[PDB]
Design a protein around this motif. Structure first.
Motif, PDB file in Angstrom:
ATOM      1  N   UNK A 360       0.709  -1.509   0.119  1.00 28.01           N
ATOM      2  CA  UNK A 360      -0.252   0.055  -0.164  1.00 28.01           C
ATOM      3  C   UNK A 360       0.387   1.036   0.059  1.00 28.01           C
ATOM      4  N   UNK A 361       1.894   1.119   0.830  1.00 27.68           N
ATOM      5  CA  UNK A 361       2.833   1.958   0.892  1.00 27.68           C
ATOM      6  C   UNK A 361       3.947   2.930  -0.325  1.00 27.68           C
ATOM      7  N   UNK A 362       4.665   0.854  -0.785  1.00 24.00           N
ATOM      8  CA  UNK A 362       5.533   1.391  -1.735  1.00 24.00           C
ATOM      9  C   UNK A 362       5.432   1.416  -3.067  1.00 24.00           C
ATOM     10  N   UNK A 363       3.871   0.537  -3.055  1.00 26.67           N
ATOM     11  CA  UNK A 363       3.379   0.289  -4.425  1.00 26.67           C
ATOM     12  C   UNK A 363       3.274  -1.040  -4.902  1.00 26.67           C
ATOM     13  N   UNK A 364       3.721  -1.547  -4.929  1.00 27.71           N
ATOM     14  CA  UNK A 364       4.035  -3.480  -5.121  1.00 27.71           C
ATOM     15  C   UNK A 364       4.541  -3.058  -6.743  1.00 27.71           C
ATOM     16  N   UNK A 365       4.084  -3.634  -7.152  1.00 29.08           N
ATOM     17  CA  UNK A 365       4.381  -4.404  -8.633  1.00 29.08           C
ATOM     18  C   UNK A 365       4.074  -2.633  -9.713  1.00 29.08           C
ATOM     19  N   UNK A 366       3.005  -1.562  -9.293  1.00 31.42           N
ATOM     20  CA  UNK A 366       2.911  -0.111  -9.868  1.00 31.42           C
ATOM     21  C   UNK A 366       3.487   0.381  -9.957  1.00 31.42           C
ATOM     22  N   UNK A 367       5.014   0.861 -10.365  1.00 30.49           N
ATOM     23  CA  UNK A 367       5.761   1.330 -10.365  1.00 30.49           C
ATOM     24  C   UNK A 367       6.448   2.339 -11.321  1.00 30.49           C
ATOM     25  N   UNK A 368       6.260   1.901 -12.796  1.00 28.66           N
ATOM     26  CA  UNK A 368       6.337   3.092 -13.878  1.00 28.66           C
ATOM     27  C   UNK A 368       6.190   3.904 -13.695  1.00 28.66           C
ATOM     28  N   UNK A 369       5.816   5.278 -13.312  1.00 30.46           N
ATOM     29  CA  UNK A 369       6.136   6.277 -12.933  1.00 30.46           C
ATOM     30  C   UNK A 369       7.454   7.080 -12.818  1.00 30.46           C
ATOM     31  N   UNK A 370       7.600   6.080 -11.711  1.00 30.64           N
ATOM     32  CA  UNK A 370       9.561   6.088 -11.238  1.00 30.64           C
ATOM     33  C   UNK A 370      10.112   5.991 -12.492  1.00 30.64           C
ATOM     34  N   UNK A 371      11.708   6.941 -12.220  1.00 29.77           N
ATOM     35  CA  UNK A 371      12.465   6.836 -12.937  1.00 29.77           C
ATOM     36  C   UNK A 371      13.607   6.998 -11.982  1.00 29.77           C
ATOM     37  N   UNK A 372      15.036   6.759 -12.928  1.00 33.59           N
ATOM     38  CA  UNK A 372      16.285   6.290 -12.890  1.00 33.59           C
ATOM     39  C   UNK A 372      16.593   5.345 -11.433  1.00 33.59           C
ATOM     40  N   UNK A 373      16.026   4.304 -11.316  1.00 33.58           N
ATOM     41  CA  UNK A 373      16.706   3.062 -10.726  1.00 33.58           C
ATOM     42  C   UNK A 373      17.157   2.138 -11.040  1.00 33.58           C
ATOM     43  N   UNK A 374      18.059   1.863 -11.448  1.00 30.85           N
ATOM     44  CA  UNK A 374      18.288   0.706 -11.359  1.00 30.85           C
ATOM     45  C   UNK A 374      18.610  -0.762 -10.677  1.00 30.85           C
ATOM     46  N   UNK A 375      17.805  -1.716 -10.884  1.00 31.37           N
ATOM     47  CA  UNK A 375      17.906  -3.031 -10.149  1.00 31.37           C
ATOM     48  C   UNK A 375      18.975  -4.095 -10.796  1.00 31.37           C
ATOM     49  N   UNK A 376      19.881  -4.762  -9.544  1.00 34.04           N
ATOM     50  CA  UNK A 376      20.863  -5.614 -10.161  1.00 34.04           C
ATOM     51  C   UNK A 376      20.379  -6.598  -8.969  1.00 34.04           C
ATOM     52  N   UNK A 377      20.251  -7.734  -9.784  1.00 31.97           N
ATOM     53  CA  UNK A 377      19.800  -8.579  -9.142  1.00 31.97           C
ATOM     54  C   UNK A 377      21.224 -10.307 -10.038  1.00 31.97           C
ATOM     55  N   UNK A 378      21.708 -10.879  -8.853  1.00 29.87           N
ATOM     56  CA  UNK A 378      22.560 -12.092  -9.329  1.00 29.87           C
ATOM     57  C   UNK A 378      22.079 -13.465  -9.755  1.00 29.87           C
ATOM     58  N   UNK A 379      21.694 -14.621 -10.666  1.00 32.75           N
ATOM     59  CA  UNK A 379      21.803 -15.202 -11.448  1.00 32.75           C
ATOM     60  C   UNK A 379      21.635 -16.306  -9.780  1.00 32.75           C
ATOM     61  N   UNK A 391      13.651  -5.262 -17.181  1.00 32.45           N
ATOM     62  CA  UNK A 391      12.952  -3.897 -17.207  1.00 32.45           C
ATOM     63  C   UNK A 391      11.420  -3.212 -17.675  1.00 32.45           C
ATOM     64  N   UNK A 392      10.980  -2.004 -16.213  1.00 32.70           N
ATOM     65  CA  UNK A 392       9.954  -1.857 -16.539  1.00 32.70           C
ATOM     66  C   UNK A 392       9.901  -0.332 -17.715  1.00 32.70           C
ATOM     67  N   UNK A 393      11.198   0.091 -17.268  1.00 36.64           N
ATOM     68  CA  UNK A 393      10.913   1.597 -18.422  1.00 36.64           C
ATOM     69  C   UNK A 393      11.667   1.381 -18.961  1.00 36.64           C
ATOM     70  N   UNK A 394      12.455   2.450 -19.932  1.00 41.94           N
ATOM     71  CA  UNK A 394      13.853   2.881 -20.594  1.00 41.94           C
ATOM     72  C   UNK A 394      15.262   3.459 -18.749  1.00 41.94           C
ATOM     73  N   UNK A 395      14.165   3.739 -18.093  1.00 48.81           N
ATOM     74  CA  UNK A 395      14.700   4.643 -16.393  1.00 48.81           C
ATOM     75  C   UNK A 395      14.454   3.537 -15.891  1.00 48.81           C
ATOM     76  N   UNK A 396      14.271   2.773 -15.340  1.00 46.54           N
ATOM     77  CA  UNK A 396      13.766   1.490 -14.223  1.00 46.54           C
ATOM     78  C   UNK A 396      13.669   0.835 -15.146  1.00 46.54           C
ATOM     79  N   UNK A 397      15.304   0.020 -14.902  1.00 50.10           N
ATOM     80  CA  UNK A 397      15.877  -0.536 -15.601  1.00 50.10           C
ATOM     81  C   UNK A 397      15.784  -1.773 -14.760  1.00 50.10           C
TER      82      UNK A 397
END
Ligand SMILES: *[C@@H]1O[C@H](CO)[C@@H](O[C@@H]2O[C@H](CO)[C@@H](O)[C@H](O)[C@H]2NC(C)=O)[C@H](O)[C@H]1NC(C)=O
Ligand SMILES: *[C@@H]1O[C@H](CO)[C@@H](O[C@@H]2O[C@H](CO)[C@@H](O)[C@H](O)[C@H]2NC(C)=O)[C@H](O)[C@H]1NC(C)=O
Ligand SMILES: *[C@@H]1O[C@H](CO)[C@@H](O)[C@H](O)[C@H]1NC(C)=O
Ligand SMILES: *[C@@H]1O[C@H](CO)[C@@H](O)[C@H](O)[C@H]1NC(C)=O
Ligand SMILES: *[C@@H]1O[C@H](CO)[C@@H](O)[C@H](O)[C@H]1NC(C)=O
Ligand SMILES: *[C@@H]1O[C@H](CO)[C@@H](O)[C@H](O)[C@H]1NC(C)=O
Ligand SMILES: *[C@@H]1O[C@H](CO)[C@@H](O)[C@H](O)[C@H]1NC(C)=O
Ligand SMILES: *[C@@H]1O[C@H](CO)[C@@H](O)[C@H](O)[C@H]1NC(C)=O
Ligand SMILES: *[C@@H]1O[C@H](CO)[C@@H](O)[C@H](O)[C@H]1NC(C)=O
Ligand SMILES: *[C@@H]1O[C@H](CO)[C@@H](O)[C@H](O)[C@H]1NC(C)=O
Lengths: 442, 442
Positions: A360-379, A391-397
Motif C-alpha cells: 500500500x505504501x511503496x506500490x508493489x509492482x505498480x511503479x512504472x511512473x518512477x524513474x532512475x532506478x537500476x535493479x541489479x540481481x544475481x542469477x 526492465x519496467x521502463x527505459x529508466x527503471x531498468x
C-alpha cells in the motif's frame, strides 16, 4: 581507504508531534576524490546492521568514487549500531520499538541529506545517488520513489522489493536455492532431497539419535525434541551457501573457498549410497561451511541486537511469504502460515504483522511512473525471486549477473570476477553518470 | 443529486505498530453515470471540514460525472465531521491529537481506495483521479506524488503547495488581496490604507471609542484593549471578500451579491473625505459582507471543531509564513514571527511547529519528476501567491482563471461564468480523459 565517523541529531518521531525526544544517528564521510567543482554524493541507505560493516564491504562505492568524483556517505539505520533512539532501552518494550519502521529510516535519510547540503560547502547544489544492497537496496529504491527531490536516482542491488503477498510465489526462493545445488554438480540436490527422510528414520531410536550425533560431530547429544531444529539448521546452511556462492574465496560470515556449492557438491555426487553413508557425506558438506580453516571442534546447532531489530521489522512491515513444497525444491514441505507467524510475533513483541502494508505504501509492482532506478540481481541469489529481473521502463531498468550470488556487483574488484559482473558494474556507472549529467544540465 | 453515506474501519496509526485502535472514516458514493464497463473513479481527498459540505459544494464533480462515466467518492479527513479517531476525546490532549497529520490522511485515502477496488465489482481495474480544493488540493497533489500507484492523476484546485518557508515571499497573499480592491474601483485600496491610522486616532479617547462603537454599529462597547482585535476582524473581512470575489451572487459563509468587492468599493471611491466620514464608508462596506440580506442587528467582532483541527495542523505541519508591510499592501505592518507563533502553539496544544517539514516530505519546488497533475489557480485568489502558476512540465501543468477567485472552477456552472473558467474547466476534463485513456491502453 579512510573515512570520518560523524553524528547528527534526529527527531525520534517524524510522523507525530507528541514526542519531541531526539537521538544521534551515526554516519560516515569519505571526501578524497570528491570534487566541490561539479561532483556528486554517493549515499548508502543503511540497513539491518552496523554501518561500519556496510562501509567495510561495499567495495564498489570506493572503486567508483574517483570516476564519479564523489563524496561517500554511509548513513546508519535507526535501532542498529550506535544509532539507538532510546539507548539500551531501545528494545525494552513495544512502546520503545514503535519508531522502528522503514518510513522513519527514509525520513532520517532526508533530514541527513538536508543537513549535509546545509553544512558542507559545495554540497548545496550537487546530485545525490542512493546506493543499497538487500534491505538497503529496497530502502534505496523506495527512497527515490518517495523522495525524488532528495536523490537523482538509486542503485538497488539484490533488493527484493516484490517479496510480498501474492506478487511472487512463496516457493521461488527455495526453488532457486535448489537450482544452485543441482547446476553445481550431478546428484547434489537429489542427495540433499533424500537426506531428510534418512534423518527422520535415525531420529526414531535412541541408538540412531546417538549415531546421528557422532556422524554430524555435534556438541550436544541429540534428543527427539531437537530433530526439527537440526533439520532447520542444515536447511539454513544450504540457504546461506546459495547467497555466498562467490567466484572467489571469502571471509564474510565464514572462511569459504571459491564456488563453495561446487566444493560441497563433490562430497555428495555419488547416488549409489546407503542412508548411513549419505549422512556422512552431508556432514562433509556442512564441514566445508562451518570448519573450512579448522575453526571448530564440534558443530553447535544452537545460536544479536541486529537480529532483534530485524525480527521486530519482520514482525511488523517486512512480512515476506516463504514456503517449501518438496516438488520444485529439495526440501521437506512447509506451508506459509500467516496466523501462526502473527501469534509468535504478538508473543515476542506484542505487535501484529500488517502483511499488505509495504504494498500500500511503496506500490508493489505498480511503479512504472518512477524513474532512475537500476535493479541489479544475481542469477544464483535466492533473493532474485522477489526482485526486478526485466526492465519496467527505459529508466527503471533490470541488470542480471549470471554466476552472481547475493549482490556480487557491490564487492571490491577481485580478478576472478566474470564478465557478467564487470559488464553490469559498468552499466551501473553508465546510468549513474547519466543522472549526474542530466541534473547539471537543468 | 443523491449519494450513499458509508463508513470504513481504519487503523488510528499507519506509522506505528504499538497502537492497534481503529475508527470509522466516513465517505460518500455517487454511482449513477458510473459505467462498470470501462469507466473511472473521481476521488475527493477530504480537507478541514464536514465531507457533506465539500460534496454539496464541489459542483464540477457532479457536472463532469456523465462525461467521464464516473463514480464519485468523497472521503472525509480524519478528525473532521464524523471521522473522529477517539470520538469526543479526539481533541482532549496532545496524546490524542498525535494522529492528525497529512501523512495519516493520505494513508487513509490509500486504504480506502484499496477497499473500494476489493468491495465494488467493476472497480478493481478502473483508473482513479484525485480531486481537491484549497488544502484538499494540496492533499490531492501530494497523493499523486506519494501514491502514484493509487491515483492516475490529480486536479489540484487553488492548492498553495508552495506557501512555505522562503519558497514565496510572506507578503504575496496580502499584496494580492490589495490588488483585488485596487482593480475593483478608484481609491478603494487607498481608502482602506488610510482607515487604520483613523481608527488609531479615535481609539485614544473614551469619547472617540464611543463614537467608533456607534459608527461601526457594534454589539459591545469598544475599550482600548479591543482595538487590535477590531482592526484584525476588519482585515479578516477584506481577506474573506478576496476569496469569495465571484462573478455571481452566492451564500457560502454569507449572503453576498455578484462581484462583492466592486459593491463594497462603491462606498469608498471618494478620496476627498474626513476621517469621521471615511469610517462611515468603511462601515457601509462591512455592512455588505455581514448584513446583505438584513441578517443582523449589530456587528459582533468576537467569534469550531473544524477550526480546532485546522489550528492543530497549522501549529504542527502546515506552517505558512504570513506578513504585511503597508508598502506592497493596504494593511498596517506586521512581520512573520516564528518564535511567537511557536510559543502560542505550545500554550494551546503542547506541541511545536516544524516549519521545514512539508518541504522535506513533499519536496517543495523540486517536483519535476512527477506527472499528471493539473494546478488550477484564480487571478483574484490571494492563495494563488503560494500556488503553481506556470507549467513545470508537459504533464505538471498550471491553469490560470482571470476573474477567478478561490477555486471558481470547482463550482456548479452558473451562466455568469467567464470564458476563462469554462475554458479551464474544459482543459481539466481534457487532461483527466487523457489519464483514463492512457491507463486503459496499458
Ligand atoms: C575441523 O577441522 C580440523 C582439521 O581438518 C579438525 O581437527 C582435527 O582434530 C582431530 C581430532 O580431534 C585430530 O586428529 C587432528 O588434530 C585434526 N586434523 C587435521 C587434519 O588437522 C576438526 O576435528 C574438524 N571437524 C570438526 C567436525 O570439528
Ligand atoms: C442590517 O440590514 C437591515 C436593513 O438594511 C437593518 O434593519 C433596519 O433597522 C432599523 C433600525 O434598527 C429600522 O429603522 C428598519 O427596520 C431597518 N431598515 C430597513 C431598510 O429594513 C439593520 O439595522 C442593518 N445594519 C446593521 C448594522 O445591523
Ligand atoms: C572493518 O574493517 C577494519 C579493517 O579493514 C577492522 O578494524 C574492523 O574490525 C571492521 N569492522 C566491522 C564492523 O566489520
Ligand atoms: C550407479 O550404479 C549403476 C550400476 O551399479 C551405474 O550404471 C551408474 O553409473 C552408477 N553411478 C555412480 C555415480 O556410481
Ligand atoms: C552454543 O552456542 C550458544 C550461542 O552463543 C551458547 O550460549 C551455548 O552455550 C553453546 N553451547 C556449545 C556446547 O557450544
Ligand atoms: C497494477 O499492476 C498489476 C499487475 O502488475 C495489474 O493487473 C493492475 O491492475 C495494475 N494497476 C491497478 C491500478 O490496478
Ligand atoms: C447539504 O445540502 C443539503 C441540501 O442541498 C442540506 O439539507 C444540508 O443542510 C447541507 N449540509 C451541509 C453540511 O452543508
Ligand atoms: C477631489 O478634489 C479635487 C478639487 O476639490 C478634484 O480635482 C478631484 O476630481 C476630486 N475627486 C473626487 C472623486 O471628489
Ligand atoms: C458574540 O459571538 C460569540 C460566539 O458565539 C458569543 O458566545 C457571544 O456571547 C456574542 N455576543 C454578542 C453580543 O453577540
Ligand atoms: C530545487 O529547486 C531549486 C529552486 O526551485 C534549485 O535552486 C535547487 O538547487 C533544486 N534542487 C536541488 C537538488 O538542490
Amino acid at each position: 581507504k579512510n573515512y570520518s565517523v560523524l553524528y547528527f541529531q534526529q527527531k525520534v518521531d517524524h510522523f507525530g508531534f507528541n514526542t519531541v525526544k531526539t537521538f544521534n544517528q551515526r554516519y560516515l564521510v569519505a571526501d578524497k576524490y570528491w570534487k566541490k567543482n561539479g561532483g556528486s554524493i554517493l549515499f548508502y541507505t543503511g540497513n539491518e546492521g552496523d554501518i561500519i560493516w556496510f562501509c567495510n564491504n561495499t567495495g564498489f562505492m570506493w572503486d567508483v568514487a574517483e570516476e564519479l568524483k564523489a563524496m561517500l556517505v554511509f548513513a546508519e539505520h535507526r535501532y542498529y549500531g550506535e544509532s539507538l533512539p532510546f539507548g539500551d532501552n531501545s528494545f525494552k518494550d513495544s512502546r520503545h520499538l514503535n519508531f522502528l519502521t522503514s518510513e522513519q529510516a527514509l525520513a532520517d535519510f532526508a533530514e541527513l541529506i538536508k543537513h549535509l547540503k546545509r553544512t558542507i560547502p559545495g554540497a548545496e547544489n550537487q546530485p545525490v545517488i542512493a546506493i543499497g544492497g538487500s534491505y538497503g537496496g529496497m530502502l534505496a529504491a523506495w527512497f527515490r520513489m518517495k523522495y525524488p527531490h532528495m536523490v537523482v536516482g538509486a542503485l538497488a542491488a539484490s533488493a527484493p522489493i516484490w517479496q510480498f503477498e501474492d506478487l511472487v510465489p512463496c516457493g521461488v526462493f527455495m526453488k532457486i536455492v535448489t537450482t544452485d545445488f543441482r547446476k553445481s554438480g550431478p546428484h547434489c540436490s537429489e542427495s540433499i532431497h533424500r537426506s531428510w527422510d534418512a534423518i527422520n528414520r535415525l531420529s526414531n531410536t535412541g541408538s540412531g539419535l546417538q549415531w546421528l550425533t557422532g556422524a554430524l560431530h555435534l556438541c550436544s547429544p541429540l534428543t527427539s525434541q531437537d530433530i526439527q531444529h537440526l533439520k532447520d539448521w542444515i536447511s539454513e546452511t544450504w540457504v546461506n551457501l546459495a547467497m555466498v556462492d562467490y567466484p572467489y574465496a571469502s571471509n564474510f560470515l565464514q572462511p569459504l573457498p571459491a564456488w563453495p556449492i561446487k566444493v560441497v557438491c563433490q562430497y555428495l555426487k555419488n547416488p549409489n549410497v546407503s542412508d548411513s553413508l549419505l549422512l556422512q557425506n552431508i556432514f562433509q558438506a556442512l564441514n566445508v561451511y562451518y570448519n573450512y580453516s579448522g575453526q571448530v571442534k564440534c558443530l553447535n546447532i544452537s545460536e544479536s541486537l541486529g537480529t532483534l531489530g530485524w525480527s521486530y521489522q519482520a514482525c511488523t512491515e517486512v512480512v515476506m511469504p516463504f514456503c517449501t513444497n518438496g516438488v520444485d525444491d529439495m526440501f521437506e514441505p512447509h506451508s506459509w502460515n500467516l496466523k501462526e507467524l502473527s501469534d509468535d510475533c504478538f508473543q515476542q513483541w506484542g505487535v501484529r504483522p500488517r502483511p499488505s502494508w509495504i504494498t500500500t505504501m511503496y506500490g508493489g509492482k505498480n511503479i512504472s511512473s518512477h524513474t532512475n532506478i537500476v535493479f541489479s540481481n544475481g542469477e544464483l541469489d535466492p533473493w532474485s525471486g522477489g526482485g526486478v529481473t526485466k526492465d519496467i521502463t527505459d529508466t527503471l531498468v533490470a541488470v542480471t549477473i549470471s554466476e552472481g550470488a547475493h549482490h556480487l556487483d557491490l564487492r571490491t574488484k577481485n580478478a576472478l570476477d566474470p564478465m557478467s559482473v564487470l559488464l553490469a558494474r559498468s552499466l551501473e556507472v553508465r546510468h549513474m553518470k547519466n543522472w549526474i549529467r542530466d541534473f547539471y544540465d537543468s
